[model samples]
Each structure stands twice: as structure tokens, then as C-alpha cells.
Target: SCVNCGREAMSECTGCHKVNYCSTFCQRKDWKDHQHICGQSA
Candidate 1:
């Protein structure tokens, strides 16, 4: 599911491999909010 839209999709963010997104664009949209926690060793 898309964290930004809450819809079903598969677009995982490997910046830290700790977050998932319905669309990769969603990752950029949420980057500001997830930047801190989107770590490789979080």
C-alpha cells in the first residue's frame, strides 16, 4: 500500500531499506518527513 495515498502498490525505498511506497515518486514526496529515519542502519 502507498503510505502517501494509502492505496495498494509496490515501490520500496532502499535508501535504508526500511520504508515502502506504492510509487517511487511517493518516496520523494515523503522524503522530507522520512529523511531522518530513512537510514541504512536504522
Candidate 2:
């Protein structure tokens, strides 16, 4: 699920592959918090 809009995710973040987003717009919107945990673990 997209962290921003709660829509069905069509893509995964290349950095972490954990966070999912429906589009780049949503991805970018979530980047601030995502970047903090992205790739930090698995």
C-alpha cells in the first residue's frame, strides 16, 4: 500500500524495495520519511 494515498502500490522504491507507491508523485511525497529508513535494513 502507498504510504501517502493508501492506494494499491504498483512499484517499490529502488532504494529500500520496502516502501510501495502507486506513482512517482506519491513516491516523491513520501521521500522525506522514506529516505530515513530506506535501505537502512532489508
Candidate 3:
């Protein structure tokens, strides 16, 4: 699920492959918080 928006995710982060995002815009919006847990494999 996207950490920023609540929309359905269309892609996953390449680093962690866990966090999902509806679009690149949402991904970037969430990067600040997501980056902290990106590669945690959670």
C-alpha cells in the first residue's frame, strides 16, 4: 500500500519490493518516510 495516498498500488519499490505506490508521484511523496524502512525487507 502507498504510504502517502490510500489509492490502490500499481507498483512496488525496487529496493524493498514491499512498499506499494499508485504512481511515481505518490512514491516520491512517501519517500521521506519510506526510505527509513525501504530495505528492511518488511
Best by lDDT: 2
Tell me how far the alpha carbon of residue 12 in candidate 2 is from the true structure, in angstroms, after superposition: 0.6
lDDT for each of the candidates?
Answer: 0.75, 0.80, 0.76
Tens digit per residue, CA lDDT, model 1, 1-42 = 677876765757768756777888888888788897766575
Task: Write the residue-wise lDDT of candidate 3 on 1-42 in tens digits.
Answer: 666677778788868777778788877776787788877875
lDDT of 2 by residue, 1-42 (tens): 787786879888877778888777888887887788887865
Weakest lDDT window of 10 consecutive positions for candidate 1? 9-18
Candidate 2: TM-score? 0.68
Error of 2 at 36 (Å): 1.4
- Backbone clash tally for model 3? 0
Q: Which scores higher on TM-score, 1 or 2? A: 2
Order the numbered candidates by lDDT, best leading.
Answer: 2, 3, 1
Task: Judge candidate 3 at residue 2 and give its lDDT.
Answer: 65
What lDDT is reached at residue 10 by model 2?
81
**TM-score to true structure, per model:** 0.63, 0.68, 0.62
